[PDB]
């Protein structure tokens, strides 16, 4: 157990020249420790693994070849209060033609939990025939085998190393496997033990193990388990490499310089190898002098990539590995290059080469994984549909093509249309035909889709609205004069398919951070938690977003023309007056709904003082567009009437204003076409005031539909908590008792107020 | 007050050197002084804006600001912990200043060092590290010729104290 | 909380949030005041057909967080999938 003191950090960073301000002690910030201080913590655990008798070598010809760091995903960096211990295990002692390789992986613990792994790699140079005392432990690459024919299930049940322990049908299997080899000659094996777990991805995103691998053999020439997976499946590749690697910084900027003597770094890190410090030990092994520590060139180049690639943010670099390809004498000048090549799990693969500038020979070849900047994803709602959404992203991306193709054949087999031809070749009307045997299996989907809306009178009008599809109907026609892709129940499945096509294409390229905060506006909400929280499949997402489109559309009564007395209006409060506040217009909406006993609510709280959207019946919308016109010419600010008039008498002040425009609102033909105002842009194409209390009655069938389309086991909470910003409660998703009350005070829910009462059974 | 409102008090910015009426030097952390001149670039104007055809009171403010080659936050609260450490080293060695002969004006107060209750060195270390500089208060002259022995020459103290005393006969 | 409990508390809350999102006003202002201020996000990436949220982000930065981004030295990069596609895929021109 070593305790990371404040003095041990500052002596270490001075020895390696790490300038970065996160490591020096400043008030108002917890003093952070270097990630190269891992080897100071874990030296006496790593080099104890080359002392056993079974690894018997000339220790004075040892060459430190490569070392690597890896932060565990979800672990915090080291602090100055941390009590830190280390357990190390040895992985591979294998006799090569160039010597006896020793790889030691030392996992550093802290308060029980592991923090980071140190993958060090040594070499006893020479020729060694000790094949009796050599071994190798490798964790194999996860191979995803995709079963498509019917003979494929027959093959692996003949493989005696496979043993499935369940009667579960399976489409695709990922084998996450580990091996333990023992050698008998240079490339024959004395024994192989290969165990591993096989895995199945369910459609509800739950991972359940199907069976196990148990292979064991003696005197072999290869591993059968891996060679089977080498040809009959693809590897789960996470290191996705770019087509053309981009250089991060160019010029001479990059140089670094060796120390004058190796004695400061030796006493700090405990690296007391006399090759680095002594004239006589370095001359004994015929190496060119008192050469630099490898661990200095680890910490020096890592401090270069921490400031020149991570913009001097110390938390971003999460993995760093290098090969000590050459040796460097002291005071040599090192010019490094730094190149951005690939991605993995949202963090940036960066590859570096350190070259001695007066010789131009390579010394280090390395690689680093740094985080991206703090990224958040917003998803576009409805309003921005156009013909041709992402068809270049459909024609050119594999992973985006399989989410359109999987979804339209869920529409054409269950609802009778193709969503690709709705997006590509936008029609003005679509006839759904209820044809033969599978066509009568499609119209009873439409019969079962029944919404219930109780009226304001309290009488439950359990009535049939679909007279238009019944047991004798053979065709139904969807009509929209603007275009079907602009019609409500077809515009929103076109978006969430397009936005998941762009997401899963972005996700397949390794672009998704783990510390992301994602969101969506109105319709985007679903496009978010299906993307990042994967709570519903591709087929169950498109049902909900289509059911929501028909839930909102026929929730508003239409006339014989199919038009309505309702609508929505986008409001810019900046255009009426520069002193027209947020509390100015939302006071206007507050009183005019209370006076006329209508419904008028601002439903989109988009931008402070620039973009609001008001919704309600059109008489209140012709009211609001005329009030904000007449308050532009009269220059009446309400907040300046707060010091001029009392609190109550502003309620009697509005009768001189709003009653004149409310009378002329009813003097127009009642289903009005709204004109453009000064501070008012009416949303052309909309007819339902959603996100308002009018649609509060229509939730209860839609709330029953989510309880069978969002299954209980698909909710992974770790992608929801603190990363999901809802639109009901616009502070981030958290399952605390104060959060449920903020939901319940805003909607008066029934299901959460049950669990808000008996809250105490949580722990 | 615009910049320090978004920052803690360990990254708070204060006035350090007052070199004139329109010559000031700010001090603080280098990142929060970089937070200062990003704000100023929003409200400043380039030098070639040509405001000669807009009237005077509706013009925009123009300035030149850049970091000095100085590698410590002198004359601020950032080094107030160092002041107790320095005069401890003054006590450990034979550092003391004897009887003064010409009046030497204080930089912060503007008083003479001959009339001190305190010693001079533990006053001046509070005066370089912590307390700010009121320079035109400190050179409130009765003087005809002024000699800068200091660094810079044509860029030194003498040129910036020239412009404060252009018509006072110095 | 036990892992069987903390799903069921999150399962009901995720459904009651989405179902009542249909009928309650979307509060995108203090939504924007989370991922601009409480999280300090540099990359704001819109995925959609047209930048109606990238332009909705830029108007909130200049109105509420211009003196905030200067003081804490954040360089926020606004991005959309409509126009700024070469910046997201790290294939720069």
Numbering used by the authors:
A (entry chain B): 1275 to 2037
B (entry chain B): 341 to 510
C (entry chain A): 1 to 93
Excerpt from the paper describing this PDB structure:
Type I fungal FAS forms a barrel-shaped complex composed of two reaction chambers. Six β-chains form the walls of the barrel while a central wheel, made by the six α-chains, bisects the barrel into two chemically identical reaction chambers. Therefore, each chamber has three complete sets of catalytic domains including three acyl-carrier protein (ACP) domains. Substrates are shuttled between the static reaction centers by the mobile ACP domain flexibly tethered at its N and C termini.
In the Apo state, ACP density is strongest in proximity of the KS domain in S. cerevisiae FAS and allows for a complete tracing of its backbone atoms in the high resolution cryoEM map. In the Apo state of C. albicans (62 and 69% identity for β- and α-chains, relative to their respective S. cerevisiae chains), the ACP density is strongest in proximity of the ER domain, similarly allowing for complete tracing of the backbone atoms of this mobile domain at an alternate location. However, the negative surface charge on KS domain is weakened in C. albicans due to alteration of some of the acidic residues that form the interface with the structural lobe of ACP. Weaker charge complementarity can partly explain why in this pathogenic fungal species, ACP is not primarily localized at the KS in the Apo state. Interestingly, unlike the KS-binding site where both canonical and structural lobes of ACP contribute to the surface area of the binding interface, the interface of ACP at the ER mainly involves the canonical lobe. This observation can explain the worse local resolution seen for the ACP of C. albicans localized at the ER compared to that in S. cerevisiae at the KS domain in the Apo states. In the Apo state of C. albicans FAS, the second strongest density is in proximity of the KS domain that is only observable at lower resolution and threshold of the AAI cryoEM density map. In both FASs in the Apo state, the structural lobe of ACP has stronger and better resolved densities compared to the canonical lobe in the KS-binding site, as observed in the high-resolution refined maps, suggesting a more stable interaction between the former and the KS-domain in the absence of substrates. Examining the ER active site in C. albicans Apo state where ACP is partially bound, we can clearly see the density of the phosphopantetheine arm until the quaternary carbon atom of the moiety. Interestingly, the catalytic histidine can be modeled with two side chain orientations, one facing FMN and the other facing the phosphate group of the phosphopantetheine arm. Based on these structures, the catalytic histidine in the ER domain of type I fungal FAS may sample alternative conformations to form a proton transfer bridge between FMN and the enoyl functional group of the elongating fatty acid chain when ACP is bound.
